[PDB]
Design a binder for this molecule. Structure first.
Ligand SMILES: Cc1sc2ncn3c(SCC(=O)O)nnc3c2c1C
Ligand SMILES: Cc1sc2ncn3c(SCC(=O)O)nnc3c2c1C
Lengths: 180, 180
């Protein structure tokens, strides 16, 4: 299925390559100017919106999630690209206008592929199937990461479905953060 | 199908985002120290090996394809990653130990997802199906790029299937280059 392949692609072509090196990058940042602040958490927080809406700025999604810093970028030779670069961004989570947590955080971009395929008629992908494909993407990624030696206790899947309109993305992440 | 999704992912999540900006990056490089050399071609050359073997160094694949330079990297905010970086590499193609062409060149990494899925039993993907999925990936990508407004005359798909062992990847690319 589409989402089956997208989840394997997300692991094979991305997470398997950055997760083995994430813990060291995070420690280098925490050991850096950051002297008086709380340490960045050790896991990649991956936002999995089941509506497949992947905006490019998280502060648009919630002004309680504000960008703090970029992690030291990782480079590797990949598929003929010398020094292919992996950047990741650090966000602070605000709770009543005070810092309640700090983590590397991003959206699972393959969900945007499902969104776009549902928009383009040439994809032969129905809007009405997108929700179940997004759930299947998340379930498959969970299945993979449970057994994968790279992704062992250094990412956190945050899946959610917005209503009512009363939704706090920051509270979703904070729920997962403080359970460690 | 798996490869259907992978081809839409490759376009939506990558090619649609770098191709609109490639021509300007290539011109900036050609207008740069490069004063006496031939200009880099205007298209992204995408290697599509139907055996799904995506090595990380092209000089391993053929010593007649040798790395020349990195293009000026492109950055954009993406899915919560500030200044997500797209690097691409420039290769020269040798013919009888003289430069016969110069182009931006890389492998279509989603083919490596098919390769890996055929290797991992949890993917439920048979080795015997990989060849037809790789062909379907290429066919779908061609179908997409024909209609896509981004990818109009700025990439070149190089699909091939090695035997005999007598195969020249450099000659494949040079065939496509000199037809412009
Ligand atoms: C084969 C695949 S899936 C996938 N998903 C997210 N990726 C990222 S983060 C933000 C982005 O998509 O640009 N960087 N590479 C990937 C990537 C790759 C390279
Ligand atoms: C969603 C997808 S597919 C895909 N295919 C190749 N991509 C590249 S080149 C080399 C690489 O894979 O790392 N950079 N991003 C991608 C990419 C992304 C971000």
């Amino acid at each position: 299925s589409v989402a089956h392949g997208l989840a394997w692609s997300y692991y094979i072509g991305y997470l398997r390559l950055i997760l083995p090196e994430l813990q060291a990058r995070i420690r280098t940042y925490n050991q850096h100017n950051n002297l008086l602040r709380g340490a960045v958490s050790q896991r990649l927080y991956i936002l999995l919106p089941l509506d497949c809406g992947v905006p490019d700025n998280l502060s648009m999604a919630d002004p309680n999630i504000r960008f703090l810093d970029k992690l030291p970028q990782q480079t590797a030779d990949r598929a003929g690209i010398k020094d292919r670069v992996y950047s990741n961004s650090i966000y602070e989570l605000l709770e009543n206008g005070q810092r309640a947590g700090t983590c590397v955080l991003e959206y699972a971009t393959p969900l945007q592929t499902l969104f776009a395929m549902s928009q383009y008629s040439q994809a032969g992908f129905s809007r009405e199937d997108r929700l179940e494909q997004a759930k299947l993407f998340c379930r498959t990624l969970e299945d993979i990461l449970a057994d994968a030696p790279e992704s062992q206790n250094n990412c956190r899947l945050i899946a959610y479905q917005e209503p009512d309109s009363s939704f706090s993305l920051s509270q979703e992440v904070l729920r997962h953060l403080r359970q460690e």
